Each structure stands twice: as C-alpha cells, then as structure tokens.
Structure 1
Amino acid sequence: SYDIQAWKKQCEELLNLIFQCEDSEPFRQPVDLLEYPDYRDIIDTPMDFATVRETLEAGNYESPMELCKDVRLIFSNSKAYTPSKRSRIYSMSLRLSAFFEEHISSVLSDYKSALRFHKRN
C-alpha cells in the first residue's frame, strides 16, 4: 500500500463516520460565547470538525499528521474547558477520541510507509 495520496479520501471517510456519531454533535461547530462566556479565556485555539473538514477539502493539509494534530486539539480543548472530568460533553469527547484513534492508526502507518517507499533508493 504505497499510495502517497490515499490518506486524504481515508480521512474524508473517517470524518463522515464521525459526523454520523451522536457523540460528535457538540464538536461539529464553534462554541457560542452567549452560552459559554468564559470559553476563550481558557482556550487559545478553537477547533471543530467542520473546520477540519473544510481545511482538508481546501487542500490545506499536507499530511494526515497535520489533520490528526487538529482533531487532537478538539479533544484537548474539551479536557481543558470541562469544569468536571464527569461532565456529559467531556465524556462524549473521550468516546469519540477512542473511536478516532482506533481508525487513524492505519491511515498514519500507511502514509508513513508510502513516503519511506518513495525514498527507498
């Protein structure tokens, strides 16, 4: 599996699966500050799944590592903002993070393998 470009459709399919998960609904769009007035006091760099999908479709990721860094930021923002490790929305973040890590592992491995094959000689 040495296709250097295959990660992009694989990440599109994984984002589609994430958009079918009920657990993703809080993380699809930005935080309304009328509902969470302190959000930008606590969080430096907002990220949501619609921003990741748009960045991908714009051709503004060079690698699946860059996409993975932005998805992990969604989850670290939730852990940072949560007032409790027993919150509803933080709990949804942890399930969705486990699902995402289970599926992104092969996408990263296959891409890095393809890049090593490209430089083999």
Structure 2
Amino acid sequence: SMSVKKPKRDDSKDLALCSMILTEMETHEDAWPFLLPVNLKLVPGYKKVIKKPMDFSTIREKLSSGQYPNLETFALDVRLVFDNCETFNEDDSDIGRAGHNMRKYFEKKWTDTFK
C-alpha cells in the first residue's frame, strides 16, 4: 500500500530472457503453424471465430518495440497462440498436436527460467 512495498524482484533481464524463449519457440520443428498470422482471407471461419489472433511473428514485433509492459503480458500472448489453436483445430490433427507440443515446451521453459 502507500509507502509499503514488497522487496524489489529483479526484472532487468526479463526482456532478454523472453527474447531467448521466443527464439527457442521460433526454431522448434513444430512451430510452423504459428510462425505467421493466419491468412484471414484464405481460411474460412477464422476471422469470425478467433476474436484475438496471435502468432510468433506478431509477438516478436511487439517484444522488439516495447509493447509488453511486463513478462506476464508476454506469457498471455504466447498462451493465446495455443488457446486459439485448440479452439480451431481438432486434438487429433497435425496442427492440433503441434499446439499441444508447443504449449508444453513453452511452459517448461517458462518455469525453468522464471519460477
């Protein structure tokens, strides 16, 4: 509260470490469904159904231009990618499996780096 603060958690490396994690996700073999924004002209249903599209290229641009205020808003957009994928894709499809795999991969790196 006013003039009463918990001790300062060191956040000075958060930008570098989120960038490293994102690099690891960009280079994973199962990242191909997620590298670029879904083409809303060419994929029926996507525009109407998926209210907040997100992809790794868009996260990388946001990260590079100071559009994440803190590491939690970064994790929210990464998870959005996988939540969108589960909304639109059957679990037993190549893309559906890719998204499960990537979410698992991310969540381990996230824990190992920050928790």
Report the TM-score range of the alignment, normalised by the length of the smaller protein.
0.7 to 0.9
Which structure 2 residues correspond to residues 1-121 of structure 1 after superposition, within 5 A?
A: 2-82=9-89, 84-109=90-115
Q: Given the two structures, how large is their TM-score scaled by the length of structure 2?
A: 0.86
State the superposition RMSD in angstroms: 1.4
Could you tell me the percent identity over the aligned residues? 31
Give me the whole-angstrom Cα distance separating, in 2, the residues matched to 1:85 and 1:4: 36
Would you say how many aligned residue pairs link Structure 1 and Structure 2? Answer: 107
Structure with the larger helix share? 1
Q: Which sections of structure 2, spanning at least 5 residues, go unmatched? A: 1-8
Question: Over residues 26-69 of structure 1, what are the superposed CA-to-partner deviations in whole Å (9 max), with x where a residue is unaligned?
Answer: 10111123441111121101000111111111011111100000
AA of the residue aligned to 1:18: M
- Consecutive unaligned residues of structure 1, counting only runs of 5 or more, are 110-121
TM-score by length of 1: 0.82
Please identify runs of 4+ aligned residues in structure 1 that moved more than 2 A.
Answer: 106-109
Opposite residue 74 of structure 1, the aligned amino acid is V
Cα distance in structure 1, aligned partners of 2:72 and 2:45:
30
